[PDB]
Paper text:
GPR4, a prominent member of proton-sensing GPCRs, commands particular attention due to its ubiquitous expression and crucial roles in endothelial function, tumor biology, and metabolic acidosis regulation. It maintains partial activity at physiological pH while achieving full activation under acidic conditions. Although GPR4 predominantly signals through Gs proteins, it exhibits remarkable coupling plasticity across G protein subtypes, with the Gq pathway demonstrating a distinct pH-sensing range that potentially suggests an alternative sensing mechanism. Our structures reveal an intricate proton-sensing mechanism driven by a sophisticated histidine network in the receptor’s extracellular domain.
We also determined the cryo-EM structure of GPR4 in complex with Gq at a resolution of 2.55 Å at pH 7.4. The Gq-coupled GPR4 at pH 7.4 shares conformational similarities with Gs-coupled GPR4 complexes while exhibiting distinct features. The H171.27–H802.67 π–π interaction and H792.66–I84ECL1–water molecule network are preserved. However, the H165ECL2–H2697.36 polar network undergoes expansion. D81ECL1 adopts a unique conformation, interacting with H802.67 and H165ECL2 to create an enhanced polar environment. The D161ECL2–H165ECL2 interaction maintains its proton-sensing role but with an increased distance. The D161.31–E170ECL2–H2697.36 network shows tighter association compared to that in the Gs-coupled GPR4 at pH 7.4. Through functional mutagenesis studies, we observed that H802.67F and D81ECL1N mutations significantly reduced Gq-IP1 signaling, whereas E170ECL2A and K171ECL2A mutations resulted in a more significantly reduced maximal response in Gs-cAMP signaling. The GPR4–Gq complex also displays distinct water molecule networks, suggesting G protein-specific diversity in proton-sensing mechanisms. While GPR4–Gαs interfaces show minimal pH-dependent differences, the Gq-coupled GPR4 at pH 7.4 exhibits slight differences, including αN rotation in Gαq and α5 helix displacement. The GPR4–Gq structure shows a unique E512.38–D1143.49–Y358 polar network and modified ICL2–Gα interactions.
Author numbering:
A (entry chain G): 10 to 61
B (entry chain N): 1 to 126
C (entry chain B): 10 to 345
D (entry chain R): 8 to 303
E (entry chain A): 4 to 58, 179 to 361
């Protein structure tokens, strides 16, 4: 029976280490604000520095 | 989650009628063409009927053309299929298939037990 | 059945946990950020030379040479800094749809409707392109493959199964199965230990290369998954489905983060990729146009309206300097 | 020579010429742009269209010189070196345009009646070679005029560039060759090519009735416009040549057809308006493309 | 002033462009076809006949190259692929034509074949591709009609109230019932084709059998007509 494999996979899904969404959101915001300066697309670099 | 639950059916004597209710949850019912298919025992799947997104266009298979009727209600996102004058040859498992993509009238919901937007079916026996 | 009842109970428990954790939409918390300015990307050098639709492309480590696959059965290396073609590799199978650039550029893998993956070396001493290795064993067409090491390659096929192959032995090191629909897109985390694969079952599954088993699953798209990308941090990914909506998920929260959709879009997201910072999300659409969405506000940062046909591929450079997008018109355009 | 004059020479020719310039310049440039776009798609039809547009533009650029010619009644102010070139550009651009129309017709006949054959002929390289051959034959076979000179001035305050109505036997034989080879033979070839195209379309059971009739209309309009534009000049020229060959130096003929000759010559310039229209603007796709380009 | 490496790169790019142009002309010279059909359609017999008259178990594509009147034809057949065809079918949006072989003698499966044909016809990326419908295995259909052991009305009740067209000319040597059934099936297919196709989408219905040796002629004529239609637009004839 293939359903046994499905239930075996499902029972593993309940063992995940869930984390509060607030911490993940704060970490993502910190990463974005720290790496915003280094992204050329977000802040267009001077035409001289642009290879194109 | 894309959930498509089928309800109804049972044992009915020849010449009776049945109505199978198909309930949808997790997606916009009105944006998709709905299909009804059957799979008789020891045989491949057969397409029964389909209804367009708005319900203005409907088609039926030649086997039950003009006998079965398909109607959809977007208020409760439910799909009804009424069967009339049942015969032993109509014994099969009926599935409520969705079309793979919205805004398209072409559907491929007759796949051999690998389709994702088909439900788990109702067994109608006569 | 007992198994069906147990599966239903587990699904209900997971849904209840998600609802309890997802008390309110994440947009409310993120709304505190100020709106992003108008990022009006402009084309720099359009690329011509392909004789058919472009279905795949990937940026190299040097951020100078990009591989491109065309349905005529050709692999062309395009130089962004010069536009000159370095290598042109004809293929025995015309319907090639996947191609990638190795981190070191020593090997390039490709595949098509055939279930055989062909790998070639671009640094041959003789100087003539040759079939370095031919991986065989797949049951379905190769959808997309991404490199994680010069010795082993991860590929996804149309048989709803992903396989890791060792280039040395040329055999399936391990196989990932469980998907109900055909696997479409693939993406590797920076550590190259976990990867997310999307299929036509409207679900995305996270697997571990070493574990060889399914780790997590992510439902929420309404339709087939057409593209998948990893957020630069590596803890989140973004998917683009046929429902004309894009969803961002977190491997730790196991819940939807942001949803990008609009009433005027009734076509599917063929390609999805993230920038180096991840603030801007670029998506290709069947309406011959590309859209840029704010990863935190979902605002339309910019629209790339210059394209003569459907937009098959899209990608950003490792350094984020420029974005190259390919379409069915046999033209690749670089925007900055 | 002959006392030949008229009151319409200074009214109809120059007004028609300015009209032709004003409507060709906006249209010929767009037609050339569309032809170049087609060439970029490696459609050999663009090469012939591009050359036709180039010839039309050259004819338009040459036209204003004769506008001055007709603004002041029958006189040439510029030097012989000037109208030496411009009257070999003006007379030969017409036949170049006819030749390129014939080339377009033959190419379309090959494309339609024989879709899967003659792949070697239907190429950009072959089209360029054919165009070069056409240009070489046109400029060099109509260069016999250049051997001789101009400014054939007489009484009645008249001086002519190539319009030596008291012509010469060699001019008459040049005119006979002009008519038969330059005009009638390409027109016959074009008619045959379009008849073959119509036959192929008729034999096609796939084409719908509406498009079938549209193709018939377009082909017949293309055929008839050539006659409308060129026939009036050619019949008068042939009549003059025959009269001279039968009655040399008997100028009594031009006295009756002097105005008609110039009117027909001016009427011929109208084909530099109709050609770009019929070949680019009437087409739905090309019209939409040029409209989008202009609106951008 | 440019470096030697730059000049070598430009020369290599020019050579690659020339090679690509030559490949483009070769690709344009030949015509590429897609062959599709059901399990009982008999694709294997047709492709073997074409290979022998007009010349790795995981292989997913079988390409047979044949020449008719010095015109090269490349026919692709799908092999080891999952029955889910919603995805890979998009790759064939540039083929000149699709030759779909339908078993007209299999009534039980003729409606599934019709549904598949309808789905192919109405696909967003296949609306520009003409379909060459080959109703194969006519001998079995004729034998069944003559025997009368099977009735088309069981699956197509409209057959009972169907009359043979007067305009069409039936074959002198064919039974009227066989001609009527074939015309009914062809009418169904033609209505499916015409319900949503016009201007840029045409269906060519023909009757053929696995033993017939003139299928290549019909395919060549179909391709000639399709290229004629394409040139009518590409050459501004409209
Ligand atoms: C001063 C000049 C421009 C006047 C000439 C008028 C032009 C426009 C006229 C003269 C002859 C005409 C054609 C004569 C015959 C036919 C066949 C008919 O089935 C469709 C229209 C068509 C094809 C006509 C189109 C318009 C036409 C070309
Ligand atoms: C495309 C193709 O098949 O080519 C045919 C064409 O090139 C023939 O050229 P000609 O008509 O002979 O040129 C002479 C011009 N003329 C008659 C003096 C005006
Ligand atoms: C260049 C040259 O000298 O030859 C030109 C000539 O070959 C062109 O052929 P067409 O005039 O188009 O033939 C049409 C015949 N038709 C109508 C189908 C019966």
């Amino acid at each position: 029976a293939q359903a046994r494999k499905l239930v075996e996979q499902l029972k593993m899904e309940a063992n995940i280490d869930r984390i509060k969404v607030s911490k993940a959101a704060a970490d993502l915001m910190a990463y974005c604000e720290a790496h915003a300066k280094e992204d050329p697309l977000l802040t267009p670099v001077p035409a001289s520095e642009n290879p194109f | 989650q894309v959930q498509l639950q089928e309800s109804g059916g049972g044992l009915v004597q020849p010449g009776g009628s049945l109505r199978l209710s198909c309930a949808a949850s997790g997606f916009t019912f009105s944006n998709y063409k709905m299909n009804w298919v059957r799979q008789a025992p020891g045989k491949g799947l057969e397409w029964v009927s389909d209804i367009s997104q708005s319900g203005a266009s409907i088609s039926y298979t030649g086997s039950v053309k003009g006998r079965f009727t398909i109607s959809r209600d977007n208020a409760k996102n439910t799909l009804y299929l009424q069967m009339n004058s049942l015969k032993p040859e109509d014994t099969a498992v009926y599935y409520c298939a969705r079309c793979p993509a919205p805004f398209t009238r072409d559907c491929f919901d007759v796949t051999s037990t690998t389709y994702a937007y088909r439900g788990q079916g109702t067994q109608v026996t006569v | 059945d007992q198994l069906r009842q147990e599966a239903e109970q587990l699904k209900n428990q997971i849904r209840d946990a998600r609802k309890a954790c997802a008390d309110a939409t994440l947009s409310q918390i993120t709304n505190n950020i100020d709106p992003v300015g108008r990022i009006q990307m402009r084309t720099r050098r359009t690329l011509r030379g392909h004789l058919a639709k472009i279905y795949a492309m990937h940026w190299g480590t040097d951020s100078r040479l990009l591989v491109s696959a065309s349905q005529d059965g050709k692999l062309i290396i395009w130089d962004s800094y010069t536009t000159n073609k370095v290598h042109a590799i004809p293929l025995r199978s015309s319907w090639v749809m996947t191609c990638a650039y190795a981190p070191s550029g020593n090997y390039v893998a490709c595949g098509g409707l055939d279930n055989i993956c062909s790998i070639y070396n671009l640094k041959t001493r003789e100087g003539n392109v040759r079939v370095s290795r031919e991986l065989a064993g797949h049951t379905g067409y190769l959808s997309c493959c991404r490199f994680l090491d010069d010795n082993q390659i991860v590929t996804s096929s149309g048989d709803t199964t992903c396989a890791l192959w060792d280039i040395e032995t040329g055999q399936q090191t391990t196989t990932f199965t469980g998907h109900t629909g055909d696997v479409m897109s693939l993406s590797l985390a920076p550590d190259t230990r976990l990867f997310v694969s999307g299929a036509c079952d409207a679900s995305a599954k996270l697997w571990d290369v070493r574990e060889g088993m399914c780790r997590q699953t992510f439902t929420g798209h309404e339709s087939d998954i057409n593209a998948i990308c990893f957020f630069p941090n590596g803890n989140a990914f973004a998917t683009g489905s046929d429902d004309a909506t894009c969803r961002l998920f977190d491997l730790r929260a196991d819940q939807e983060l942001m949803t990008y959709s609009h009433d005027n879009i009734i076509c599917g997201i063929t390609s999805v990729s993230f920038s180096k910072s991840g603030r801007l999300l670029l998506a290709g659409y069947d309406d011959f146009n590309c859209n840029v969405w704010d990863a935190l506000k979902a605002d339309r940062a910019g629209v790339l309206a210059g394209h003569d046909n459907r937009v098959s591929c899209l990608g950003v450079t490792d350094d984020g300097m420029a974005v190259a997008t390919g379409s069915w018109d046999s033209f690749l355009k670089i925007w900055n | 020579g002959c006392h030949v004059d008229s009151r319409v020479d200074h009214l109809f020719p120059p007004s028609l010429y300015i009209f032709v310039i004003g409507v060709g310049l906006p249209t010929n440039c767009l037609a050339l742009w569309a032809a170049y776009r087609q060439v970029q798609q490696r459609n050999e039809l663009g090469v012939y269209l591009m050359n036709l547009s180039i010839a039309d533009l050259l004819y338009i650029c040459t036209l204003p010189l004769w506008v001055d010619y007709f603004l002041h009644h029958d006189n040439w102010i510029h030097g012989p070196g000037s109208c030496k070139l411009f009257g070999f550009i003006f007379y030969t651009n017409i036949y170049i345009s006819i030749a390129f129309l014939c080339c377009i017709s033959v190419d379309r006949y090959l494309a339609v009646a024989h879709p899967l054959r003659f792949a070697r002929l239907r190429r950009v390289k072959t089209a360029v070679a054919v165009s070069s051959v056409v240009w070489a034959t046109e400029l060099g076979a109509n260069s016999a005029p250049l051997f001789h000179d101009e400014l054939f001035r007489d009484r009645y305050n008249h001086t002519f560039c190539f319009e030596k109505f008291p012509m010469e036997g060699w001019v008459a034989w040049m005119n006979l060759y002009r008519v038969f080879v330059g005009f009638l033979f390409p027109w016959a070839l074009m008619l045959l090519s379009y008849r073959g195209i119509l036959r192929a379309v008729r034999g096609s059971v796939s084409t719908e009735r509406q498009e079938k009739a549209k193709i018939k209309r377009l082909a017949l309009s293309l055929i008839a416009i050539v006659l409308v534009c060129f026939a009036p000049y050619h019949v008068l020229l042939l009549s003059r040549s025959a009269i001279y060959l039968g009655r040399p130096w008997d100028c009594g003929f031009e006295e009756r057809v002097f105005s008609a000759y110039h009117s027909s010559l001016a009427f011929t310039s109208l084909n530099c308006v109709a050609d770009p229209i019929l070949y680019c603007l009437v087409n739905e796709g090309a019209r939409s493309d040029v409209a989008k380009a202009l609106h951008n | 002033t440019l470096s030697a490496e730059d000049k070598a790169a430009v020369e290599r790019s020019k050579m690659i462009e020339k090679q690509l142009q030559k490949d483009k002309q070769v690709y344009r010279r030949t015509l590429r076809l897609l062959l599709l059909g059901a399990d009982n359609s008999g694709k294997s017999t047709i492709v073997k006949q074409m290979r022998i008259y007009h010349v790795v178990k995981t292989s997913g594509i079988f390409e047979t190259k044949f020449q008719v009147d010095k015109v090269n034809f490349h026919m692709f057949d799908v092999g080891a692929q999952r029955d889910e065809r919603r995805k890979w079918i998009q790759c064939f949006n540039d083929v000149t034509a699709i030759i779909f072989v339908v078993d007209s003698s299999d009534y039980n499966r003729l409606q599934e074949a019709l549904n598949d044909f309808k789905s192919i016809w109405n696909n967003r990326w296949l609306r520009t591709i003409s379909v060459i419908l080959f109703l194969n295995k006519q001998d079995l259909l004729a034998e069944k009609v003559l025997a009368g052991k099977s009735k088309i009305e069981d699956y197509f009740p409209e057959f009972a109230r169907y009359t043979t067209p007067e305009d069409a000319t039936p074959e002198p040597g064919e039974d009227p019932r066989v001609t009527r059934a074939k015309y009914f099936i062809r009418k169904e297919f033609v209505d499916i084709s015409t319900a949503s196709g016009d201007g840029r989408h045409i269906c060519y219905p023909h009757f053929t059998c696995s033993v017939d040796t003139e299928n290549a002629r019909r395919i060549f004529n179909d391709c000639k007509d399709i290229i004629l239609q394409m040139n009518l637009r590409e050459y501004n004839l409209v």
